[PDB]
Amino acid sequence: AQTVPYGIPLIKADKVQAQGFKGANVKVAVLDTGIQASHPDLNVVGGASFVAGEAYNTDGNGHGTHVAGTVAALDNTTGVLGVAPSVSLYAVKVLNSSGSGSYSGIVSGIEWATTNGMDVINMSLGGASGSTAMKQAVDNAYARGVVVVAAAGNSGNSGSTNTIGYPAKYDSVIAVGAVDSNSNRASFSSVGAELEVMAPGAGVYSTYPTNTYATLNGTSMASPHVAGAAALILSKHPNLSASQVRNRLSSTATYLGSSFYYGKGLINVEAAAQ
Numbered sequence: 561a562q563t564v565p566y567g568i569p570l571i572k573a574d575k576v577q578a579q580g581f582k583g584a585n586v587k588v589a590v591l592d593t594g595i596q597a598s599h600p601d602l603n604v605v606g607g608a609s610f611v612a613g614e615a616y617n618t619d620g621n622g623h624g625t626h627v628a629g630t631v632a633a634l635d636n637t638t639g640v641l642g643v644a645p646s647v648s649l650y651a652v653k654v655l656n657s658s659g660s661g662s663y664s665g666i667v668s669g670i671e672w673a674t675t676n677g678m679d680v681i682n683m684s685l686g687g688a689s690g691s692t693a694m695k696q697a698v699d700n701a702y703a704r705g706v707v708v709v710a711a712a713g714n715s716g717n718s719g720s721t722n723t724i725g726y727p728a729k730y731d732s733v734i735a736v737g738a739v740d741s742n743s744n745r746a747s748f749s750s751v752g753a754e755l756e757v758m759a760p761g762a763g764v765y766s767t768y769p770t771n772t773y774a775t776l777n778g779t780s781m782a783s784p785h786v787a788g789a790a791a792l793i794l795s796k797h798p799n800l801s802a803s804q805v806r807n808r809l810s811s812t813a814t815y816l817g818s819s820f821y822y823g824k825g826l827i828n829v830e831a832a833a834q
């Protein structure tokens with residue numbers, strides 16, 4: 561039997577999938593700790609590794625496999641179901657088993673995706689500081705027609721202090737926050753003027769290293785929901801540019817409260833997919 565994570569219906573992904581739009585022919589690159597390619601509920605078509613000693617098709621952490629399942633866990637009679645189960649998944653390892661990677665390794669992963677015709681890039685990662693080479697890579701990937709989604713950060717808030725990390729803080733990147741099954745903001749979701757949209761990030765169940773499934777919390781779980789929504793929209797309107805898809809997502813989001821806390825609200829793919 562296949563479990564359907566509460567995040568799929570909450571963002572109305574099940575409604576557009578039912579119309580027969582599931583991300584087919586859309587290339588998605590998950591810049592993470594790799595992906596357990598052998599996982600029976602995932603189909604990795606390719607990728608690259610910029611982490612010394614580790615192949616792209618192995619995940620010693622569990623993070624990238626989890627994020628990848630949220631985006632494209634196969635629609636079958638087992639495991640879970642992804643937001644866009646027909647998307648072409650590319651694992652780009654830019655982080656190691658400990659969940660860390662250099663700036664060089666990240667911008668390299670960004671360039672590889674842009675150069676190899678990736679339609680969407682998900683970066684469930686962030687830092688307190690950015691780089692000029694990082695900003696350059698992301699801006700050029702966006703201006704070239706790639707949708708760039710990044711986790712906003714798990715530094716909750718302070719008292720009127722922007723806690724959005726990099727690259728989420730960049731103009732060309734969609735900063736994603738986290739809500740729970742009740743659609744309420746999760747207390748760990750970063751806050752700031754760059755917050756753009758929200759998605760399921762608390763108690764998210766997805767694929768996990770060595771043919772199993774686990775539950776994780778974090779804006780690193782929310783991000784793949786928007787990356788998958790972007791893939792769903794593209795599989796329906798392949799004529800859209802990055803900014804139009806981006807626009808669809810934020811203009812049709814369900815308002816939830818102050819934008820400094822919820823951005824434009826929780827995404828709605830049925831409305832976004834037109």
Ligand SMILES: *[C@@]1(/[C]=[C]/C2=[C][C]=[C][C]=[C]2)=ON1#C[C]
Pocket residue numbers: 684685686687711712713714725726728776777778779780781
């Ligand atoms: C996720 C993470 C992510 C990030 C961090 C910082 C900044 C940005 C992004 O979540 N993990 C896990 C669970």
Ligand SMILES: [Ca+2]
Pocket residue numbers: 562601633634635636637638639640641
């Ligand atoms: Ca499945």
